[PDB]
Structures are given as C-alpha cells and as structure tokens.
Design a protein around this ligand. Sequence first.
Ligand code: MG
Length: 706
Amino acid sequence: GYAFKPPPRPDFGTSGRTIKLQANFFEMDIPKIDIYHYELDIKPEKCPRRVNREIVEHMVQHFKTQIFGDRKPVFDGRKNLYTAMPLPIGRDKVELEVTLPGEGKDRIFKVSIKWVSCVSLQALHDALSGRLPSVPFETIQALDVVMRHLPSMRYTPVGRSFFTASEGCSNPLGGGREVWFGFHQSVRPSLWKMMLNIDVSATAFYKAQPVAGQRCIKKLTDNQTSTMIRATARSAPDRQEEISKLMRSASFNTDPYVREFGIMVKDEMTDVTGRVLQPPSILYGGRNKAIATPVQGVWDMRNKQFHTGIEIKVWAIACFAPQRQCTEVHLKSFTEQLRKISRDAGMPIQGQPCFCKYAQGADSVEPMFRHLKNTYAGLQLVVVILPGKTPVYAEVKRVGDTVLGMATQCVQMKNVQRTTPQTLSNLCLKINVKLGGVNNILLPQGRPPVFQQPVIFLGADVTHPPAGDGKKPSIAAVVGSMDAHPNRYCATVRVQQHRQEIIQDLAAMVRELLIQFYKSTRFKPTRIIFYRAGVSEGQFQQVLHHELLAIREACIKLEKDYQPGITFIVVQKRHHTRLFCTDKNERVGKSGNIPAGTTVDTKITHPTEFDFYLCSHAGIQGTSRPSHYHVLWDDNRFSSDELQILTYQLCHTYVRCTRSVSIPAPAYYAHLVAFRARYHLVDKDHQALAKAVQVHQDTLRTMYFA
RNA sequence: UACAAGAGCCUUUCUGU
RNA sequence: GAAAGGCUCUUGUU
Ligand SMILES: [Mg+2]
C-alpha cells in the first residue's frame, strides 16, 4: 500500500455567477440489502460471450429447483455472477452439463458455481456520505453488472457500450456501413447518491443487405468518416435530447433484473448548480498598454501591442516548397503582410530577410542551417516554408532545436500563398514567444492570492508509443514557469522505459526546473503547483506516491531543509461527463454550449475528495468537454474557489492564441514538449535516445515548443 | 507545419467474439 | 480501456 491519501474537500465553491445546469448523471435508488457474489467457471476458456449468457440463462431456466430457487441473477459475461438473495449452496461447488448444437457440430459444456464474497450496499451507502474514506470498487462493479445485464441482451454489447439498430434514421454511409446509434453506460459515485453516467454515441455496423449486428473493423475510405460526422453532428441541446430520449426509451425502472435488486433510477438528468467564474484581465504592452477582457473566453489583439516585443533585425527564409508553387511574388507578399502585421503587434521586423532561397529534401536541412548559422551573425529566426506533411519538418526541428540551437518557425505553403490577418497574427505570437518576448500577462491585481509569494507552476505529461512494441520508448516532459507573470516556461524532457505511466526521472527534471527558476527569479518557490496530465484513476495512488516523493527529493537536492508546499492536480479531459444549460438564455454560440469558466464541484463529483470540473474553453462545435481536475495532494490548503480561479486564470495564459484553453498552460506545454521530443526521435540504445531528445544549450532556455 | 475545439475513421491490443 | 496517435472532417477566427 501507500501512505499518501488525497486530501478531502476544504469547502464548496462560491465565487462566480450561478448557472443552472443539467449533467448526464441519473440518480440511483440503492437499497441497504446485501447482494451476493458468485463466480462461474466454464470449460474451455474460449467461450463466446453471447453463448456464455445463453447457457447462463439455460442454467437459470433448467436448474431452477436445485440451486437458483426463484431468483433471476445477473452475469457480467465472463466470470462473476450476482444474486440479491442467497442460493442454497453455501460454500459448495456444483458441476452441471449443458447441451448445445453448433455449425454442423455439437457442443457439450461444463459449468461450476462458486460462492465468493458477501458485498454490502450498506457499506456503500456509508462510503457515499462522509463515513468511509474509500468508495468500495467491488460494489461499483457489482452495481454496473446489475444495470448492464439487460442492455447486454436486448442490444448488442460493444466494449462497455450498447448499440442498437437505427430505425428510420439509417445513414447508408458507403457500401454496407450504417450509423447504428448507442450509448455508454457507467455507474459513478457522488456525495448525494449513486449516479448512472450515460452518454450517447454511434459506430459503424454491418446489418447491410443480402447476419445483422456485426461491428465494422476493416478498412475503407475517408468518405465514410465525413458522412458519419454529418450524421452524428450533435450540439449540446442535440446530445441532451438524445440522452434524455434514450433513457426514456430504455426504462431501467421496469427491468426485472433491476427490480430484483430493488433499484430505482431517475428518468431525468441531474440538476446541478454551476458557477461561471469571471475571466482575468489580459494586460498588453507598447504605448497604450491596453487591457483585454475575454468575452466568452475569446479576445483579440486589435489595437494591442505585445507586453514585450522582440524587434527582428536579421531573419532568414528557407522555403522547402517548390518554386513553381511557392513563387518569389508569394514570398514577397507574405513578407510584406507579415512585417506590417508584426509592426501592428509591437514586434517590428526591420527590412527584408537576409537569406531567401529554395531547398529540397531533409538531407539539405543540416548543411543549409549550418551555412545560415555561420554566415549571418546575430540571426534570430529562420522561417521554414513547408509543402504540407514532410520529414523535412522533423529534420528542421532536430537541427534547430538539438543540433544547432537556431530558432525556427514553420509555415505551410498554403498560408503563404493566401495570407489572412489571423494566421499572420498567430504566427507573430509564435515568433514573439520563440524569440524571448512575452505577449501578455495576467493582470497582477486580478490574480488569486497565491501570486503574492514566489510560486512555480509545473506541467507534466507522458506520451507512450502504441503497444506491441518495446524498441520505441516512452517520453516524459515536464515544464516549469519562470516568473511571477507566468507565461514563459522552460522545458525538460526525458526518455524512459516503454509504456511506463509514472515519470521515472522526475526528480532530475524538477531539480533542473527549480535551478532555472532560482536563476531567473532569484527566489526559490514557496509553492509548487503541479498539473499532471494523462494519469488514469487506477494509477492515482502509485503515480502520487512516486511523483510526490520525486518532487520532495528534487527540493531536498536543491537545498537542505527546503520543503515548499506542493499541490498535485491531475487533469483528465477525456471522460463522459456532459454539462448542458437548463435555460436557452445561457447557451453560447451555435453549438449552444456552456459558457467558458463554468465550474462544477457538486452533485456529480467525488463524494469525499477535492475534485471539480471546469470548462475553461468556449465550445464552438459539438458538446464541450469540461476538463476534470483532481487534487491528489495539497500542502498549501487551497480553498476550492481559489484553486478553481487559479486553474481558470492559468487556462488564460496560453501563448499560442488569444483564447482560454481547456487545460492550464503548463499541461499544454508539457504535451507540446512531449510531441516535439517525439519529433526529435524520427531519425532513430537508451543513451543514443536520451541524447537525441536533448535540445541545444541555446534552445533549452527558450520556448522552442510553442 | 497559425491556432483552438469537437467528433468520426483508422491503428496497434487488453480483449470481448 | 488507453496510448493518445495518426488520418481526416467540421466550426471557424482580426
Ligand atoms: Mg501527451
């Protein structure tokens, strides 16, 4: 076991304006009776699940008198069976025989019943309301099996989801593909009661025309995914109506396999009271030092200059696109437009580029870049025109970031031939950040009280190669804020063993980031806020145990008797929690989604632990997915309001756009550093790969990854 | 490879068949 | 269930 438990909730959030919401969680009436856990062993071990459930029903209907009495038990399909009342077998094991036909053959099955444990729903009710510190996971799987018994028979199971055939609304897609509609069904705990999380979904099947229920797994063209996008395009009201109609049609409250366990489910979505946090003010620079107010999570840079602008004296253009497509007229027009746009933004580009020549292939990247470095003293930036996807991008990134230490920016050919003010403005944001300047900062007086002391913000993420591997290693990236502003971040990366979830060398990189912070700000951080991405809920305990100890070890290696407060937050942006507006007057945009800054820490979240949802971004397509934040550790004793406000404001510090993003800036930066390090390994034994992801000394202290 | 966000194919594969 | 990765597509935007 581990000795680090996640902290409980300090309080509930109060700040922000109240918004009425409806989450796709359905209240569950769980009785206090004890249900009984069994296990079924069937030989051989390669039985189909369909005939497994069929022979389970055959035993129930056949051996009714001997064992099963008058009960209807539930089965997950593979191993374990549950019954609401105890079968008269005690600890005994009974071997029975099942006769079945086959595809021209005959099958004889042997089946055994074994008692396992007595799981209690009273203990679950105690754990759901501040009595037991841990929700009993065995009870959760038992309840999930109970509620997914009949969907596994009426519909066709697909993973954890059930898909039914489309009636009337069938999309032919292409060939024999269809648009079979279904839903993900899961059982989640909450402080108030048990919740049935249900989200609507669709996938291709093979009912076709001259056996139905065959899911598509083969390969086809790109037209099918576009047609399925057009068929399944659902805004927030569309998903809300689909899930509500699905729950009204399914009717769990009339299922006999649910009634024997004495369970009621609510047919309506749970009403949850959210709060829309106000956005921070964005302080720009230049002459006016204009202040931008994010309206619906989006602001602009019109009549605004960078907080610190980098004047570009000498720059180069390396066009790897063909001359006949990307001409000199296009390059000159792009240069003039970029110079005027950057002059508007407080980033003056003085004069024409020193170098502007064409090149071909990734083999020419290193000699051309070496010539650029050795010929033009004081060179600040090389613009790389690329003809779409190419290995030239990976070679350029490897040469500029790890080999030569040259700041480079890649632009597609299509964005040079046809320029837009927004593309050039976003480019200028990238250039200003890549050249050492800061675009904007949070308003220092509009920031939470955490910023009144030296505080570093860390973001971590691990990218793993797909399984069936082991020559390809995993990459762990950690970034750290470098001022009280925080908008500039230093990046540290490591290569580690394949498919490893914890960060093995976290202490070394956190030590490097702390050293860089102490160099840049001349102060050690009194508070370390650690945003960790890509950690599953099962891995929470081992990830916390390894990584909190690694952070403490790094702080000790920095200086004796140096133990700053650490907050460990795990970001999960992939889940099935969907939030909708109860009233139409609070829907935002054509997608009708919740406004940016909507935070939920009630009634759908964890019973006894510091966790919350925050939709910091403004959804413009589909239904917004609010990022989930779980506080695995908190030495600083953050209030809920302060932590949520800080998270939202950190989501407002992303430098690549004038937008509020779904996750805070350090987590996004760690993700980008992991992707960049993956690009650095394209040319590729651990020491050869540890040296490959190591960026140049002139590249280490800048935001190459932006 | 201007950027954000949301979905689908598709890929290993734990499998479930 | 998940690594998120590709492949796109959509909304687009100063
Ligand atoms: Mg990642």
